[PDB]
Symmetry: D2
Subunit: 506 residues, 4 copies
Amino acid sequence: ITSVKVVTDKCTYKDNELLTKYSYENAVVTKTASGRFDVTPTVQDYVFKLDLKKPEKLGIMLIGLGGNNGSTLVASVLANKHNVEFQTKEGVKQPNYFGSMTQCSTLKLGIDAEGNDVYAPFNSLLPMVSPNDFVVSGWDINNADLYEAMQRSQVLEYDLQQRLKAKMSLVKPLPSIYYPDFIAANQDERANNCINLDEKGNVTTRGKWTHLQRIRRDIQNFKEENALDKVIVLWTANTERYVEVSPGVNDTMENLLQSIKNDHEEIAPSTIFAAASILEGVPYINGSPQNTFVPGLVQLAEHEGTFIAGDDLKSGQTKLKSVLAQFLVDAGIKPVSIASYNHLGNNDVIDDIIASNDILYNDKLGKKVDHCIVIKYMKPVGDSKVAMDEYYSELMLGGHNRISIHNVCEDSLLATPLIIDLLVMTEFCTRVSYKKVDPVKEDAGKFENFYPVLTFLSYWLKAPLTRPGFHPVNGLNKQRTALENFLRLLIGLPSQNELRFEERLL
Amino acid sequence: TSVKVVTDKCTYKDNELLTKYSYENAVVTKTASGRFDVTPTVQDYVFKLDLKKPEKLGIMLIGLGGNNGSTLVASVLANKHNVEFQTKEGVKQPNYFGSMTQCSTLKLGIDAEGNDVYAPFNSLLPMVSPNDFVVSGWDINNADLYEAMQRSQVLEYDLQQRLKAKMSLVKPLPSIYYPDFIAANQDERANNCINLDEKGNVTTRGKWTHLQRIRRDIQNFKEENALDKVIVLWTANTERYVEVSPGVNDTMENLLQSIKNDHEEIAPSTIFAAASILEGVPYINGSPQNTFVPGLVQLAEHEGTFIAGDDLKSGQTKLKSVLAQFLVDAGIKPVSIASYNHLGIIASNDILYNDKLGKKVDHCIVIKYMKPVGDSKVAMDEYYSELMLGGHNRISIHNVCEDSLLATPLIIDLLVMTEFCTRVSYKKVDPVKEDAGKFENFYPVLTFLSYWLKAPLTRPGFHPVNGLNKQRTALENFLRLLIGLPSQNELRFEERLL
Amino acid sequence: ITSVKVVTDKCTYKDNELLTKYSYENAVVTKTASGRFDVTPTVQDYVFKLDLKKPEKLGIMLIGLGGNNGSTLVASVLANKHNVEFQTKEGVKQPNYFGSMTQCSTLKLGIDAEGNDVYAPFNSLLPMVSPNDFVVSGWDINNADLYEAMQRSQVLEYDLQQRLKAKMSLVKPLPSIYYPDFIAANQDERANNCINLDEKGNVTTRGKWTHLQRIRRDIQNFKEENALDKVIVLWTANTERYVEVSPGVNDTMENLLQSIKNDHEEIAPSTIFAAASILEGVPYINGSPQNTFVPGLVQLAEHEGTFIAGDDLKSGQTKLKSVLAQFLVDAGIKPVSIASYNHLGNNDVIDDIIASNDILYNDKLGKKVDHCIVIKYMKPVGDSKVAMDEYYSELMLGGHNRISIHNVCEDSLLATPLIIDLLVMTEFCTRVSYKKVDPVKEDAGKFENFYPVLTFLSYWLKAPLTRPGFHPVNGLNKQRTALENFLRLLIGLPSQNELRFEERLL
Amino acid sequence: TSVKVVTDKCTYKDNELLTKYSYENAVVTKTASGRFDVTPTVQDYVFKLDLKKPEKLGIMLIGLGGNNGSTLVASVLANKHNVEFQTKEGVKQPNYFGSMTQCSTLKLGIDAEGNDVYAPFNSLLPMVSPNDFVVSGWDINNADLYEAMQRSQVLEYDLQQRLKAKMSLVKPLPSIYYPDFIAANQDERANNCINLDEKGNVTTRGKWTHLQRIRRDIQNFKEENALDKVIVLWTANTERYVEVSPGVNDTMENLLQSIKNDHEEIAPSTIFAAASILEGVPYINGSPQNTFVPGLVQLAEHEGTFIAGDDLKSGQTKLKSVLAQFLVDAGIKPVSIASYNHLGIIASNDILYNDKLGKKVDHCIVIKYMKPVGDSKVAMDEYYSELMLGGHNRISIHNVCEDSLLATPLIIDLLVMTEFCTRVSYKKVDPVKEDAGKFENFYPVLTFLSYWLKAPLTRPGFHPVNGLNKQRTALENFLRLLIGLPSQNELRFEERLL
């Protein structure tokens, strides 16, 4: 086992509790009616409290348990938990979690003897839950046990599915909530595992409060049956249609909970799964694009003080594009056109970047981008995901650049480890407590929990759901920095500056 | 276009900036049982930045008649004189697109609502504009820069014509041609060399007199144009690597002597370099050859002058660097990298790169010659990584652009950043002895300029990081500290916290 | 000048008339109720009459004269006709017709002394019109003279446009016919050159017969003003919406001409330009995808005995795909998925291949293809056309192939020479006459003209319009073969067999 | 599955086919003033096709333990025994996808309505099925073919297991290993060689005895399995080119002697070839090396035996050949072709390729080694052509597939087509002397098999066409004439004419 012992007094231990002091330095900027920036620094001290005792088993309830991500996840955990080696064309492979930052990436702790960089495992600084400690279950509008889910999905090697057959067969998703009007038609017959059935087994959108109670009961039951204390709920099911945000309906907490009791039309399944989890007090992550997190719902999250994070899983084509686009502005290149294309076979941003650079995107030179996306359905590819993106930037003196990003991989294989990270991090956050510190008054204040809306998880979410007034930040590399810096911080380590003065300077 | 930060770490005399700075870091040690013991370290500093920048910066490029040279000049002239040009897409306004110092911006902090506030890279402190560049230089071929431009075929013909008049005035100085360090297929060009004999013929004998002629060239340039500040940058055909041997080039003592003896390990770039450092002028080497031999490094130290760091960073290697890094950040193991071009991290993550899995990566470089593509280069980089549970990932990067349109702004950046580091001197003060000690300037090797160089040069014992993101982060954080701001943390605690 | 003197008696000369005899051998195939093919050969002799005296100037009337193709065409002719060298980054270039089969490709005449292949220019066998002999004019719903058309188009080098400025400025398209309901909205204001205006300059779809007469008068006037004898009309304007084929309307000749007089709703501009040309007796080529050639219209073509050819211009991405797809079946590979994408910035098949191979596409193995096309609008590319096509075929024993075709070029630059070929060939066809020959009776029969619907031109058209009962053939390579073989034929040369027995055999 | 054509050019005796054929062509001559004078030429022939095909064809592959070898075997077994296998996409049925003879079809003519009628390639005349293949062969490494299969990693693991039992039975024969013609990094494999000495060690001395051992191997194979027809195909690691010199390999006389003298220009493939021709067995060479030296060609002529034509045609070069041709058919000048791979027409059109424009094309071959990609190869071919009026075209071809899955069916095709040409003898009759003369068989070099070979072999004085379309057209037209049908004309006169 690997661990780090940071020798600092900025933090101490008191009963599986790590207490760290930290001086958060920022700066406020102003502008003069003549073009000037008046930067006034800011400082604010805190004391962070990390509950060192992590759960021995972490509950995981997936909405879409039978899909590609859902089945693959369980597959992975089981495989890894049991060291279920498997056969392939390349021979017997050992199971792993490649693609997981939390589980495979490293972080620089500082320099060694010879002034050279030293890295450690992302999870070797502070105690995080091992995905091998996940106790996974969930819901799905389809009853197929997880082995049939694997067969159907076609993501994992045939030999591996067979070695997992025995156990994966015993895992059957709980009946879920189905409201037909919220998803693409082709999911009709797929639904044969619904908790919402009228007096005669017929999907009925009426009685949504009865449904809200069920999911909640479901969570409570999943917990006691597994002797678990902690559980997180992650939505990874078909994308619902966007829901309209209208005053009187879901604008406030009261109006949302009401609409649920009135069986309102703007109340969706995820809204119910979301509302439940929160009232149940368990973190809820929205791995899909729809806007289940309406203002009224958010208020509930804040009131109950329960974690939430969401809006899509940022993977492959979407990451590799965030890095490519950023990089092109960090060099002062103006990417004009951007053709993006997709197409899979299974049952499945630049505006902020174009705003950070004003010498490229102003009024005289221009500030527009012809970005046209595309995800056609080429079923004849199973889970193989081909993704082409081409940027046609502008160079000095009339020249142009033309960069292409051709991508091809088993999508749900990248998605699973990403889902794993979201859970490992959100569970870790459920143990971080912080207290603001008055410089002129000792131990003033009571420890608090992260503001409900956990934005630290954005590195994995495509549309970071931020709190009101705050504009989202999609810079992928930046997103990771906040993560490591935050962990660095928690053990008494400074934020990376990359200055290297024990080399730049005599 | 100006940043006025209110901190007590900065005080201004008469065109001089003084800044306090608590530099933090940490030393790590993996115990026997693989347990990292890390000890934090803080070192206080005081930097001095001469606020009076040169009103005109002198630039001498070796290989001024090439693609990069002529394009650099044309850009300066074009921008400086706002010369617009005609194209199929209509009239265009010149610019320095691609230049980080000219077209990039930085995050100063947040505004009232908690949103990010950005400002131009150059807007913080004062830096010299490329419009204030006075450019000259050497070249074994003597074609005036119009002809150099025509010959390069990288710039629009209408623009090329509009600059004809001024570009014609610029003619490169004769250079040192040691035919043994290039390719004899580079003899048609060599009609402008100083190193000649009585038979008029080119010669490799009399290297010290050649060296003195370059010094002369620099003085003449400075006086002739009435300049105080001049910078030299190599952007000429790559040279064959020279062997570093004792008693010849291992010391600045032997070096100056081997140059007097005409030693076979003394290359043209070796002369230009030494001739530049002797004239106290900075020297950037934008080619792969190892000019900065050890002995040559001492001379720079002794003379207290600046030196660069091997080969101009290509746009492909910029991306390969950025992207390949991103793969390891995600936890994905790129077991293969079969890339190859042509034209007219295993040390970071060891969880995937260890003697348990696979500490190796299939890499190969392939640049070929295809005269017809013109200045337009094409680059292909295929990445084959393995995912969890037997899966694999295949990513390809296709790139096409006129190389020079990318090297030029990158050259401008280096020049603007060297000139900057020129007006920066620091002092390592202790908290147990205020204002004690004299100011030294940046170590001879301006390692801060590794963002624009493929093979970063270094001070022995240390491995240079090639991570572009971090190579830009370091630089960005330097500007910040210099004006009292701290290193970006990205923690956004006024949003993540109550 | 290059020419070929074929020493054969299969043909002789009589007053600028080349008379060639030819024995066309084919074979009829049958199938047995047990799986067998009863192939019974066929022979039929003919005498071809080629009118050797080609027109000194060929009239060309383009519908879309102001578009990219229209302007570029005139540009090219003028440039080439006058040897208008021009400046570029690569220096002074000489004008040419690269991309033109008719003008640049070669054909094998046979072997030399040493048994090695000998090729000659596609136009060096029989006399064809030089595009430098084109007298171009036309119509367009926009008045911009052709120089403004060039500027607007942005296809040609800036320096070349300037050297052509003088002359191109004097070329202004004739007013055209505009029926708003037949095209994408964005062509509204673009229309300021219309012949159809009510009592007060307002586009009116009424009086279509008045319009029919105009175009006809237009053609007659274009001819006499240029002292021309021959003229061809090529449609290269915005794509109209498809027209419904309904009985009583355009099913027969009588019903079509009637609907025009009744100002019918299913009568489109091209229908009128098409009907006119035909009644005027000039070949009409449809360079666009719409179905202007309805049955009723076709009947008129046959009755008047006037040439017609049509339905889209087959270029780049569409050719290179016809060759790629064919080739994959000629090797017995089954291409399953096929992702095709496009996107330009200007004002702008497998079913038969999957039917020729029954060992790959049957009922047990399957006979489907997930072909999804795409042409998004990335205006920020001028005329640069990026085209990506990716095929995911199947190999023996579960393996797969993945081939990509990345294409990028100035589209209208490929289109122009293609348009040139269509005209050179159709004009050449207007001089080929043929007489069937009775083996047991001398000089029986009167010479005839190709059946109206000229299918020889398909090598350039995407959807070959064939006569009733006949299924179209899209095999590009095959299409060219018929062209060379036909020319070979006309000078007394056998069809290529590639047998090479003076090498395969002792 | 059977074609019965009704023509008078074909008559059938007792398992013998006789066909009349008027072969037409023409001789051209460019006069002084560049005017082609063409004189047509007709030559009558009479072909004889032995209608009785072997009930079991013998196959001996040199390098039977490689990727191609083991895959060839596995396919035959899989197909022959209808062994289905499991995959992520579910159960699959074996097949010979990719094989032209097995999965391609031909146009026989048109039906009632005037539409094209197609029939399987093999359906016309009778050809041997790959299911009737009895395969054996040599290999310097002695791993049984299961292990060879495991080692190759080209076939699905479930399929691989399902064939384990039968594949294990197949073990390659010892081969001739002259370490000097390959790569010493090929010594770990060589644990199965016949050419040994008393110190047991491998030796290059005694080449004639090695040659006699191969003959022995062939006889033993034929008798052991009770076969009359056997074919040999080289599919082993490429050999270093050998120099053709007089008095050593310029004649079949010198050749058989140099082989007796142990000459340094006698390679293993040189032995297998000669040993094959001496046993009267056909020999296909699917590697680049020039085994078929001149002297070795004479032996084949004298013995009246068949020989192949250098290197198995890759799927990339198949496309490069097809596509590049298509460009010249359109009139587009591909002034550049910067292509390159890696893994685990200027003579036709002279209107663009003349000393007025540019008779040159930027071409370069680049195959590299990237162990990790597995059997999956990736190919990139970029084409930069010029269009009319200063424009340009850039086309790229990306290709990824498991090479062997493409070489195997191509190998099967060659084998099925050689066996076919084996039962074909012709006669050159005159119209001025009926039934006069004896039947000869296809010239030693089966040039009809250039569709599946990169570097077509030839009879001196003639340049082989590499145009795949035409290389397939020639073949297709042969089947046709053999059964009375004429060469495809594509004139479709029953539609184009009234």
